[PDB]
Amino acid sequence: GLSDGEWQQVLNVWGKVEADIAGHGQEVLIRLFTGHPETLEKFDKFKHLKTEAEMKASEDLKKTGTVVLTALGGILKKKGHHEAELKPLAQSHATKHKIPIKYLEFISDAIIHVLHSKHPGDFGADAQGAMTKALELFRNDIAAKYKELGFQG
Ligand code: HEM
Numbered sequence: 082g083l084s085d086g087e088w089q090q091v092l093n094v095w096g097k098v099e100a101d102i103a104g105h106g107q108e109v110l111i112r113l114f115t116g117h118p119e120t121l122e123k124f125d126k127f128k129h130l131k132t133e134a135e136m137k138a139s140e141d142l143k144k145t146g147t148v149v150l151t152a153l154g155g156i157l158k159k160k161g162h163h164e165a166e167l168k169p170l171a172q173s174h175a176t177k178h179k180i181p182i183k184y185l186e187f188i189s190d191a192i193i194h195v196l197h198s199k200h201p202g203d204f205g206a207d208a209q210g211a212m213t214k215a216l217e218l219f220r221n222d223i224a225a226k227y228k229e230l231g232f233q234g
Pocket residue numbers: 120121123124125126148149150152153169170173174178180184185188
């Protein structure tokens with residue numbers, strides 16, 4: 082999917098996320114949830130939050146933030162050689178959580194948003210381009226598995 086120059090960009094940008102996984106993961110989910118509230122309904126432990134302060138105030142959300150971005154970071158470091166770590170991911174989001182691939186689109190957008198926000202001016206045009214394709218690759222490999230399963234919705 083990507084060139085090596087491009088993976089290079091991806092991994093350079095991921096290095097900013099690794100300096101504060103917890104803080105980045107928090108703001109990614111908050112951006113996802115405040116923007117697309119129907120997404121909050123896919124989590125029974127976040128059902129209760131109703132405001133963004135409460136969200137910001139939840140330590141559990143930070144925890145969930147760290148799990149999601151730790152797992153993502155592990156896939157990105159495989160430079161597209163992720164059949165092994167994505168299958169399980171794809172199977173559980175489809176059969177167990179029942180996550181439409183649109184929500185995966187939404188968080189992909191939420192990551193890009195958050196990176197600009199926390200790093201205004203040092204998330205260059207090339208960087209945005211390498212990162213965007215990486216997330217698209219991710220999402221595409223998941224949609225193929227969703228298709229197998231007929232996870233129609
Ligand atoms: C960037 C893409 C994402 C990654 C890497 C990711 C990763 C993970 C991981 C590692 C887990 C725990 C292990 C498992 O259940 O497989 C998890 C659970 C879960 N994910 Fe995802 N996830 C992503 C996107 C989403 C999105 C977009 C939603 C819904 C809007 C979502 C909803 C859930 C739910 C409901 C659980 C179970 C939560 C709990 O009770 O702990 N995930 N995810």
